[PDB]
Structure formats: structure tokens, C-alpha cells
Design a protein around this nucleic acid. Structure first.
Lengths: 159, 293, 170
RNA sequence: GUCUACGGCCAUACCACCCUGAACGCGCCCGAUCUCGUCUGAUCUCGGAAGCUAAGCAGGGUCGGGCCUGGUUAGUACUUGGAUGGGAGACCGCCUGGGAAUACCGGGUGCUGUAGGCU
RNA sequence: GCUCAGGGAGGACAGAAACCUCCCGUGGAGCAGAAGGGCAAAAGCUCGCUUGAUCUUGAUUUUCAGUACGAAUACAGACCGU
């Protein structure tokens, strides 16, 4: 039986990177988290105030509360069969915004603009996407010169 | 021999500190407590008053910090007192007070807050604080960045706080550092604080030296004799300089002068040319070797 | 010929006496360094316990006295009457700070007091140049170049030429 | 071009020597009557403007050490899935896809806001 | 406010080791204790002052039946420190 002991098997999890100990750089501090925003979690060793438990490290989850020093945030997390989603409070250093939540807010600008413009002249503007379709025929022009005869190579010992 | 300390290893593992520490100016510990804002206020910027006192002069900016990097809403320096009838006295406790009052009356000139909040016209020399009225725009509530200035009961950085509050700002402050405060008896003196602001602490050292002998009067108060600044027009003059700040606060600049277009500093030598420098050094060592032998 | 900003002045004159007793033997080592200078010296304390001499943890040992400036040539010139205007080629360090001392205090000019006594002393001048200052201030500190550093070859010629002294190997 | 005040990213920015600084900055500097602190106006606080680019700082320099980013190592090591494949075992062949790191050889050597100037 | 483990070259008796200096130094020290993390104008050395180690209703994390204790996180209201 292993131990219970909140920071167990975090020997390399809450560490710092090589040539990155020391002072907390200051931009980290000064970016406004709003309610709703989607966010991803990653403990930091430098500040022992405000950590999440080792299980939520790695995950992702939207915000529901803002105060002086923290944010309250909703994640999912398994357990045996079922999925309990749950409210955990964390200090700001152990957090970034979520970064596949702004490739959607700039294609929605491209999708809104080209169904109001391109309508008054007369063309249908396909905004839906399709996964890589199967390629079609093409010519391959030799230019006087030719291909190469790759015979394979005979064994030799090398030690 | 001794081991060498700084060998290949040493550098491989090195972590340099931030730039502004290597240079040696910013103190991050305090900055971090100073610059930032409590999340449940969002953007609603925090405000400071920077003060610095250079060798020959004084500087007074005001700022709030953005992520891209902090922004100076307004600056009134101590090299512009040449334009308010002040020929000398540009580094001193008395001229920390004018460069603090220039900043306040210039910032209240820039947002439509001229008539609201006057502060003080008479220099009394005691604890003062700015209220907020009904049905009018409110007061400024910034803080004091002190830099790396040992903060002791007598220091010109505090001269610049008291300059801005008497103009019309609501900065939180204390009289435990303002000159005159007897730290032994524990009461705050009024008219020893007033003697240092107008500039009669510099007046004692003209009559003390000249009555003793004419030797140390020469190197010390030399540009005082040069511009005609006697001890009689010492308090006659520093009551004139606090009226032109109130009358004419707004800033006026020079035009951008025409460019000759010439090179002073050296450009970075080229890949080719650095290679040009290592087939002539190698070759000319080996010709003079056959010349020597 | 030379620039006027390199004038190798004297910075400080460190003076101390080492005794090894706690009582009336230590207080009389501060009276000898107060009849010459004119400023009271501070008593120091220890690092650890090695009974072979016998100075317990934080039991008092030595007493020191720095003075600079106008009082950096009146005391130092008295000590060179007792050292007869000479040093050895193993008294200089490898920055450029020259070390010497004397056996007793009376011939420096101080009169013998019956109860205080006589105590040997341990001189140390510290050379410099306007701008070693830099490396000590709070605000914007730096180092001090290499053409500005003193060597073991600019503390020698400064001594033998002005005072008409002598220095000998071994 | 360049520099000051306050910065964001934190070595393409650090370290060792060496060659250049014109105007305005910024500094070494000279004081200790008052404010403030020292065994010592050295530092810390305060007043000034006789002296010089020697230094801190800036630009450049170096078959320089590091740091950052390519090429070799290499489709070599490892691998998901697979067949009633070989072999006494150890372990190793092919099937279907994912693919690492030195040594050795290249080149680069800080960008960039907010606000006052100077050529 | 101040910077260490340790290293070199100097100095009266003083020596391997008493204490004074100048230069080199990414922490090789230190932070009550097992061991891992974390920290250099400090979380470490030294002074100054003090007692948020005070009273009080809820949310949450951890072990989990998503019950108890134990211990932990993020707020609100007193009166206080510096």
C-alpha cells in the first residue's frame, strides 16, 4: 500500500524547468480573467500558496467566480464509473486562459462576414469544412534526364 | 594549482537575472506589491507617482501598468524651472516641492479639473488631506513609488509627495518622515517643516560662511553670486515661483530640428569581412616565419 | 604624460590589536587606540571553540579602528619611524594593498600610563583611485574595469620614489 | 542615429580581454552649517558646480568560452496493431502505421512599448 | 537593512587552526526534524517594534460511501499589528 500524502508522486510535477527558477515574471500577474472564460491548469512550485491537487494538473475548465486573488473554476474528473464535475478554487499563478477557445472566435468572424458580403452579386459561400479529400490525377514531366536505379546494399560488420 | 571556478560547466548551468536587475534599478519585490490590481476590479487601472532624484536634478512621472509595458500619463520634470523665475536651486528639498506641484497642477490642467480642487495657496507646513464633494468630479488617489531611496525622516522624495497633495491630490501619507518631526518627544512640528520648503535652510549657509571668512563662500555659493541671488531675495523669490505654476501650468515644447544625416557610431562588421580578417593573419604569420628563418 | 582622474590616494587606515582574554586585559586594548586617533573603537566577537588557545563561542577577542582622509597620513607616517622606511617583497598582496606592523606602542608618540600599559599593533593601509567608490553604492553598482584596478607593480613604485624608502626580496 | 525615467519578453541580452565617444543626458567628483547615519560624510541623508572621459554606461572587435537555431548521426534506437513466422532457449526475422539524443560540420549574437530631449 | 558553503593573496607574538583586510564565488550554504520540492536587494544573517497562534455564520479540496474525524483552499463582518 502506498501512502496518502497530498504531494505524493509530484517529484517532477511541481518542479521548475532547467534555467527557470527564481522570480515570477510579471505579465502572469496582470491579465484579467473574466467569468466564463475557458482555462487550463498547471501547478507551479514557486508559490506554495494556492495550488490545485495533483489530479487536476493537466486538465481544463471554465470559470464561475472572481475575487481579489483567485478564481473559482469548474472542471470534469472521472472516479470509478461516473463523472463528477466540481468546483475548485485556485490562485492565479497556476492557470492560463484556454487556447483552442480563440481559433473559434476568428473563424466565426470569417463565417459571419462572407454570408452578408458576396450575396448581393450572386454566389453561394461554403462555410462548412471537409477533412482532407482524396487527391486527383497529375502529370510528372521528366526533363531530358531520368530516374535512378536503387539497388540495395550488401552487408558488412561495423564494430 | 587551485581548481578553476568559472569553467565550461559554470556557464552551462548559469541563470542570468532579469535585465533591469543586472543594470540595477528596479526592485521587483516591491514593484509586484506596487504595480498590480485585485482581480475583482478588472482593468480599472492602479495609479502611482514615480519620483527620482538624479545627481543634478529631479524627475516626476505618473503611471499605470499594462502588459505591453507601463504608460506615462504625465510628467513634469525639474529642468523646466528655468521658465518660472528660478535661476538656481534645482536638486534640493525646496525644488522637490515645485516639481511635485508642477506635476499636480499640470495633470489637473489635462482632464478638465482646473477649478475643482485647489489644494493650498499659503504654505503652512502641516498634515493636509483632500476631500470629495457632491455633484462634481472626484479626486486622484495614486500611491508613492520611492525607488531605492532609504526612507528617512529627511529626504527629498518626500518633498515631492507634499508638492502634489497641496496642488490637489488625495495621496495617503505620514508626518513621521517630514522634516521637523521630533522622533524623541513624538510630536509633529509645523514651522520647522515650513522652513525647509520655501528655502531658508540654504539661506543660513550664505551668512554663516561670509561672516566667518571669504574662502568657502567662493566654491560653494558661486552660481549664486554669478546670477545675483542674495540672502535678501531668498523668500522674496520662492513666493513668485508657486504663482506661475497656478497661473500657467500647461506644457510647451520645441520643434523637431532638421537632420544633417551622418554616421557617428560604428556598424557591425560582416561575415564576409570577418572571413577577410582570417586568411591575412594566418598567411602573414607564415611569410614572416620564412623571412625570420 | 598622465590623466588627472587616476590620482592614487589613500582610502582607509585599519588599526587593530589581538589579545585573547575577557576582563581588564581587553578594555586596556581600546585605550591605546584612543590616545592617538580620537574616536572610540568597537569590540568584536568569535566564530567557534578550539581550547588549545581558549576562546569560547561569542567570547571577545579583537578591537578595530578605521580612519580616513585628513587622518590617513598623520598616524601612518608615525608608524614608518618604527619600521625605518622599508618593507619586504613579501608584504604586498595581488590587488595592491601593503601590510606591516610594530612590536610596541610607546615610540609612536603616546606616553606610558602605569595601569593601561603597552600593546603591539597591526597596521593596514588600503590604496585606491577616484572611482573604486562605484563598487559599493546601492543604486546602480558595477565592477571597476582592468586599467583602473591596482596591481602589485603600482603599490611598489608609489612607496620607494616619494618617501625615498627601500624594499628587499626574501 | 542616440540617451534619459518607468517598463514587457528574460543570455540572440551572460562572461573574459581589447579598440572608439561629437551634442545633450547620466555619472566619477568637492563639500558637512541644517535635515538624516556611521568605530570611519567610505555607504546611507544633505549643500553645491573647481576638475575629466581614467572608470560605471554605450558602439564595435575575437578561426574566443557559453546561450539560440539548422545540418550529420537516422529512417539507426524505441513503438501501436498483427500471423498456428525462425529458434533447444536467449533472443531475432518480416506485416501494418507512429519515429528519439551526443560526438563531428554550418551560420546568428537582442528585440520592443509609454513619456522628455540632444545631433 | 545585510549576503552566505568554500577558495587565493596579504598582516606584530600566531603555528593547519584566535582575529583584521582587498579580490574571486548560480548558491556548492542556510530555513527545528525523515526524505523530496521551493527560496539570493530572499523564504536565508542583524536590529526594530509586536501577538491574524484573537471572535464568528456559511462554500470548497483532500481520504471518499463522493459519510465522520484529522489536516488544507478561496471569501465575507469585527476589532488589532506594522
Amino acid at each position: 500500500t502506498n501512502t496518502k500524502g497530498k504531494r505524493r508522486g509530484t517529484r517532477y510535477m511541481f518542479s521548475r524547468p532547467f534555467r527557470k527558477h527564481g522570480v515570477v515574471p510579471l505579465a502572469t500577474y496582470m491579465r484579467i480573467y473574466k467569468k466564463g472564460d475557458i482555462v487550463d491548469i498547471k501547478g507551479m512550485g514557486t508559490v506554495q500558496k494556492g495550488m490545485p491537487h495533483k489530479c487536476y494538473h493537466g486538465k481544463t475548465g471554465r470559470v464561475y467566480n472572481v475575487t481579489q486573488h483567485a478564481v473559482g473554476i469548474v472542471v470534469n474528473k472521472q472516479v470509478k464509473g461516473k463523472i463528477l464535475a466540481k468546483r475548485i478554487n485556485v490562485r492565479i499563478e497556476h492557470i492560463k486562459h484556454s487556447k483552442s477557445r480563440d481559433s473559434f472566435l476568428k473563424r466565426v468572424k470569417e463565417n459571419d462576414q462572407k454570408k452578408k458580403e458576396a450575396k448581393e452579386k450572386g454566389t453561394w459561400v461554403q462555410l462548412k469544412r471537409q477533412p482532407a479529400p482524396p487527391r486527383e490525377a497529375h502529370f510528372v514531366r521528366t526533363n531530358g534526364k531520368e530516374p535512378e536505379l536503387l539497388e540495395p546494399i550488401p552487408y558488412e560488420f561495423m564494430a | 594549482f587551485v581548481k578553476v571556478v568559472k569553467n565550461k560547466a559554470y556557464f552551462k548551468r548559469y541563470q542570468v537575472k532579469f535585465r533591469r536587475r543586472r543594470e540595477g534599478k528596479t526592485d521587483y519585490y516591491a514593484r509586484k506589491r506596487l504595480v498590480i490590481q485585485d482581480k475583482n476590479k478588472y482593468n480599472t487601472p492602479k495609479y502611482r507617482m514615480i519620483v527620482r532624484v538624479t545627481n543634478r536634478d529631479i524627475i516626476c512621472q505618473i503611471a499605470y501598468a499594462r502588459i505591453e509595458g507601463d504608460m506615462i500619463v504625465c510628467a513634469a520634470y525639474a529642468h523646466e524651472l528655468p521658465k518660472y523665475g528660478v535661476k538656481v536651486g534645482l536638486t534640493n528639498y525646496a525644488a522637490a516641492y515645485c516639481t511635485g506641484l508642477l506635476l499636480a497642477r499640470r495633470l489637473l490642467n489635462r482632464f478638465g479639473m482646473d477649478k475643482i480642487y485647489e489644494g493650498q495657496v499659503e504654505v503652512t507646513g502641516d498634515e493636509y488631506n483632500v476631500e470629495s464633494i457632491d455633484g462634481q468630479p472626484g479626486a486622484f488617489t495614486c500611491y508613492l513609488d520611492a525607488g531605492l531611496a532609504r526612507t528617512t525622516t529627511g529626504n527629498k522624495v518626500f518633498g515631492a509627495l507634499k508638492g502634489a497633495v497641496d496642488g490637489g491630490l488625495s495621496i495617503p501619507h505620514s508626518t513621521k518622515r517630514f522634516p521637523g518631526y521630533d522622533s524623541e518627544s513624538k510630536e509633529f512640528n509645523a514651522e520647522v517643516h515650513r522652513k525647509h520648503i520655501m528655502g531658508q535652510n540654504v539661506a543660513d549657509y550664505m551668512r554663516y560662511l561670509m561672516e566667518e571668512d571669504e574662502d568657502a563662500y567662493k566654491k560653494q555659493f558661486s552660481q549664486y553670486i554669478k546670477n545675483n541671488v542674495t540672502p535678501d531675495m531668498m523668500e522674496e523669490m520662492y513666493k513668485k515661483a508657486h504663482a506661475a505654476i497656478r497661473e500657467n501650468p500647461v506644457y510647451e515644447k520645441k520643434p523637431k530640428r532638421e537632420v544633417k544625416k551622418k554616421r557617428w557610431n560604428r556598424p557591425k562588421m560582416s561575415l564576409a569581412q570577418k572571413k577577410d580578417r582570417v586568411a591575412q593573419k594566418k598567411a602573414s604569420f607564415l611569410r614572416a616565419q620564412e623571412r625570420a628563418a | 604624460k598622465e590623466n588627472p582622474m587616476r590620482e592614487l590616494r589613500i582610502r582607509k587606515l585599519c588599526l587593530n590589536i589581538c589579545v585573547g582574554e575577557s576582563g581588564d586585559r581587553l578594555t586596556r586594548a581600546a585605550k591605546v587606540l584612543e590616545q592617538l586617533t580620537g574616536q572610540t573603537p568597537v569590540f568584536s566577537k568569535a566564530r567557534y571553540t578550539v581550547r588549545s588557545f581558549g576562546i569560547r563561542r561569542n567570547e571577545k577577542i579583537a578591537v578595530h579602528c578605521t580612519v580616513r582622509g585628513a587622518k590617513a597620513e598623520e598616524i601612518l607616517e608615525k608608524g614608518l619611524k618604527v619600521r625605518e622606511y622599508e618593507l619586504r617583497k613579501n608584504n604586498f598582496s595581488d590587488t595592491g594593498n601593503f601590510g606591516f606592523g610594530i612590536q610596541e606602542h610607546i615610540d609612536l608618540g603616546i606616553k606610558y600610563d602605569p595601569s593601561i600599559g603597552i600593546y603591539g599593533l597591526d597596521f593596514y593601509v588600503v590604496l585606491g583611485r577616484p572611482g573604486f567608490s562605484i563598487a559599493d553604492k546601492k543604486r546602480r553598482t558595477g565592477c571597476i574595469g582592468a586599467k583602473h584596478r591596482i596591481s602589485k607593480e603600482e603599490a611598489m613604485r608609489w612607496f620607494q620614489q616619494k618617501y625615498d624608502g627601500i624594499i628587499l626580496p626574501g
